[PDB]
A paper describes a structure:
ATP-sensitive potassium channels (KATP) are ion channels that selectively allow potassium ions to permeate the cell. Specifically, they are inhibited by ATP and activated by Mg-ADP. Previous studies have established that the functional KATP channel is a hetero-octamer composed of four inward-rectifying potassium channel 6 (Kir6) subunits and four sulfonylurea receptor (SUR) regulatory subunits. KATP channels in pancreatic islets are composed of Kir6.2 channel subunits and SUR1 regulatory subunits.
During cryo-EM data processing, 3D classification demonstrated continuous conformational heterogeneity of SUR1 in the ATP + GBM state. Specifically, four peripheral SUR1 subunits wobble around the central Kir6.2 channel in small angles. This greatly limited the resolution of the overall cryo-EM density map and deteriorated local map quality of the peripheral SUR1 ABC transporter module. Further improvement of SUR1 map quality at the ATP + GBM state benefited from focused refinement with local search on symmetry-expanded and signal-subtracted particles of the SUR1 ABC-transporter module. The map of “the isolated” SUR1 ABC-transporter module reached a resolution of 4.4 Å and demonstrated markedly enhanced quality, especially for NBDs. Instead, a previously unmodeled density inside the SUR1 central cavity in the ATP + GBM state map has a distinct elongated shape that matches the GBM molecule in an extended conformation. In contrast, this density is not present in the ATP state, where GBM was not supplied into the sample. This unambiguously demonstrates that the extra density inside SUR1 central cavity in the map of the ATP + GBM state represents the GBM molecule. More interestingly, we observed extra density on the degenerate site of SUR1 NBD1. The shape and size of this density matched that of ATPγS. Therefore, we modeled this density as an ATPγS molecule.
Numbering used by the authors: 215 to 277, 283 to 329, 354 to 406, 411 to 616, 678 to 739, 768 to 921, 996 to 1040, 1060 to 1321, ...
The structure:
Amino acid sequence: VRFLQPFVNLLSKGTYWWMNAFIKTAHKKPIDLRAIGKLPIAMRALTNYQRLCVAFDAQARKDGARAIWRALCHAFGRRLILSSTFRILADLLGFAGPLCIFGIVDHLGKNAYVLAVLLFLALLLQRTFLQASYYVAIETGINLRGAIQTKIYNKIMHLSTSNEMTAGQICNLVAIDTNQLMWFFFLCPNLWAMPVQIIVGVILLYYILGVSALIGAAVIILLAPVQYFVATKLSQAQRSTLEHSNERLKQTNEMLRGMKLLKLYAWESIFCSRVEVTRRKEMTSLRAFAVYTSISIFMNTAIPIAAVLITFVGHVSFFKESDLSPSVAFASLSLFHILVTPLFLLSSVVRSTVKALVSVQKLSEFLSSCVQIIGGFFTWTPDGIPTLSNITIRIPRGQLTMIVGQVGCGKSSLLLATLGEMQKVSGAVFWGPVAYASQKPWLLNATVEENITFESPFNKQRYKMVIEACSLQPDIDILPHGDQTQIGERGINLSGGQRQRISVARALYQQTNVVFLDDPFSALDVHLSDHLMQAGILELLRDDKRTVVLVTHKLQYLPHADWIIAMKDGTIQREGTLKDFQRSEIPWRACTKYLSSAGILLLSLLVFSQLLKHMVLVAIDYWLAKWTDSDQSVYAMVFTLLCSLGIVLCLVTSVTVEWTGLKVAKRLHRSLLNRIILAPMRFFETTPLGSILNRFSSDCNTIDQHIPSTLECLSRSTLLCVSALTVISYVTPVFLVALLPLAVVCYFIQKYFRVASRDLQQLDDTTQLPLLSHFAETVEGLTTIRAFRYEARFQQKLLEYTDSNNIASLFLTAANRWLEVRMEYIGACVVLIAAATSISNSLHRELSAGLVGLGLTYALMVSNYLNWMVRNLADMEIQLGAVKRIHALLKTPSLIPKNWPDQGKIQIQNLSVRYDSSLKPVLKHVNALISPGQKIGICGRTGSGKSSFSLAFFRMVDMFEGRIIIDGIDIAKLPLHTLRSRLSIILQDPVLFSGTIRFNLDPEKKCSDSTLWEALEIAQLKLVVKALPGGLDAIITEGGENFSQGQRQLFCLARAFVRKTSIFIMDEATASIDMATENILQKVVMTAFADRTVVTIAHRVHTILSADLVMVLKRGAILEFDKPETLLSQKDSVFASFVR
Ligand SMILES: COc1ccc(Cl)cc1C(=O)NCCc1ccc(S(=O)(=O)NC(=O)NC2CCCCC2)cc1
Ligand SMILES: Nc1ncnc2c1ncn2[C@@H]1O[C@H](COP(=O)(O)OP(=O)(O)OP(O)(O)=S)[C@@H](O)[C@H]1O
């Protein structure tokens, strides 16, 4: 245990002194979950779940949305109200501070040291109570999140299967709804403490400025509803923008997958044009969003100026000509800031409260939704026509029981009913932890060994037996990681047969009596199914005398079982055995590049405008200082001039930040796209897709959403802090020399913070990722988990995960409180010293009263500007560190005028090729020649070098040696664009990117309609194309199920037809295609290609047999042969015929 909050001295419970040791150790050694503590018994999943379920029980025994609400209320009780009362007392003392400022200012102009030390004490106490309030509220919220999370997970166990969309709604119910609830519980005490704050503020300012005060008290208040309105607009804009963004991502996911396909003919620019077309729409939305952001930032600092303007001008020169002592004006200034700070929070509080109300309504709607069988009766509804009718079945021990029938006869339904999964209406069923593999296979977010063990102690002989008996070890070794390979989400990097074999292995490996397998032979061949039923079923299951109940439909399994079960229309037609059935019927460089992408045009326009705005904001008060003592009319007019300058300059600065941020986002995205386009193929193959896709998915989005606002806030905070320091220095010179020590202290407080605040931050992210994912895994494979009776262990795992999340999200708020309190203590020390120097120096000797006003008013508030500064600095640093990876990604004609000849005669003399710079060579002394108009075949085993030969023919490998030519022409003087408008290629991996048929046939779109129609008619595709809406305009999706595999290859051949390269490369147009269709495909491609030399590569016999010139790829080299009928009998059918 390390997080000891409840077990320390009640002084440190306030000032967080126990964090000194943690943060000092954290500076040196990197924090981790082993270096972190464990949550106390006072706050776990179990404790909060216990209190919440006790309250829910006491409320439901007296029987809903209001019910769950009151249950949470009575369950979390005293802590929340304690935080709220801390908060209101702090608010009172904060409203009290400026009045003692006023008293001091009065006394010196006409008992003040006492007021100064009282101000010091009241500041420190008020801020301490505020911080304790924040922390207690945050901890209550974290408790509530853990509690309702484990509660809705407990509910996930008892729900019914009849209720895809529900899974997404469940995981949003944990990712956004629960966060809304918890953040609303953060802001709950603020909603109680805001009204008393504004009421005390208005009544206090009225008694200081009189009737005029009221007028001012209106203006500031009028900003609070307006703000809300602005916020709403933002939200609307956000929605629209998000939509566009999503679409863009889709149009990217294709390009970053058909990489080799894309670059094999250089259609990449054609798709980049479309990608840029989407980007402009996205940019257009962003303008309005940033305009609203600018309006918000503008009002933020405009209302403070406007209040003082329309109040002071409307007080003296309007109403009663009352002499305005410096105390009145400066107290009004202080109260204006102390009231502006809370006003913004009310809008966000209202939004958070309504959103939390909706989310709790949603949570309530969700949260409240032998083997003997005699008289089976049930259905998939609380009321409806039944599908289970009159089923009586006995499943004795040690007996193979097949279930056979037609499609839709209640086979798997009977399986789940035997499981107890479906509580039958009227019937009896008796038989426990039963192993079960469902029809649709499911996996976890873990390794292969883990999925097959499934929380079971590992075995050597047992596990190796199960691995070998499932025909799974070779394909397991085929994976990039021989074992312990991280199986992707749902098994994207695996095939269906592998998932099925893993599921069957999981079912077989578990030690239990009963095993169900819902058709485990649907995605398996004949050989693998035979070996599985022989070794794993009849030899391994039948070994330990288990009760195997397998449902399938084959021939070999019928005489191997004991009981045959025939189902028809949900009824057992006949029953018995076989015989009874047959006898019956971050450095400054990242920011430097970020701002230099904007250019010199806007950098200075931003910086100098900010400097001038802050200079105006200080000069207005500097002139007010001389205004005070008493040409009052001229004074007020100068005040009005300054007030106007301030607001105009603020609007200018905001518009500048907006425009600059948008331009930078534009240029950065375009440069990233362009630099990713020109990368080599081996680079794309080396780097995983997640990192390349992820930068565009988030980095871009993150920057656009948060960099401009956070940068603006950081700049405003730092300049306001520097201005306040300069003010309190100019007021009292000696005070300056006292403030530089303390500020240096802050430097030491800075380092130790960041080197931990960053760390904890990332830890939070990590504990958020496997938690949510875990949830999803439980939802899909719910039947398997309720069948294995493994609910207890999984609930244990989820309590573990939510504890690991809460400890991180708790240490983070503890560290934020630490930095806050210490920076605030120093911000109170500085105002203490400033007032103590001002009372003596500026009164006893200097005798100038306009000074102390400015100094006190700025030192009463310097601390909040300091805190804004430091927090925004931390955020800007993490965001700039996120940006740096974008730059890391950023750093990755004599024969032309003569038309490319149709003579396909080529010759590659002494060719070699390597993949990486200075690695093992792929080819060795490759010499070959190809005659015009002659079909060429190439053979070889896997890894022989035929794909490498094709890629080198398209010079896709960047370490080839020798000279390679086409009609005396090579790659020494031609750019890539000409090199891709000269040859055609059909890859083994076909794809149909989204769009219309015109976008797939000719994405360039140069070709005319009759040309595409003829290409479809020749490619045996015109009839199915005419059977679609519109014709040549069917909206296709990436991959999908809109066309057959043969039709995808027909589209590839149509691409080849329209390419008109006159040279064709056929890279395994045979794999994963039915022979009945592949043979007619090759016949069409032969009858269509009488000219325009084609070089093919495959592992089929007849394809290699039909080619004229063929070269057998040896271990490292090739051996070519010209006449096909001569080399297939010269070696006496040893190396070229039986191999083919
Ligand atoms: C902006 O301040 C305020 C100023 C005045 C008032 Cl009347 C209220 C607040 C205020 O904020 N309302 C209290 C509720 C609240 C929410 C966030 C913060 S916080 O400081 O930003 N964040 C943390 O402490 N920890 C986070 C919490 C989320 C998980 C990760 C760690 C502090 C407090
Ligand atoms: N989880 C479910 N929720 C609601 N209805 C279901 C569910 N599973 C199946 N059904 C319905 O129950 C009917 C019968 O389903 P099955 O028992 O799976 O068909 P079966 O032919 O006996 O076995 P199969 O096809 O190998 S899974 C279908 O028409 C479905 O609409």
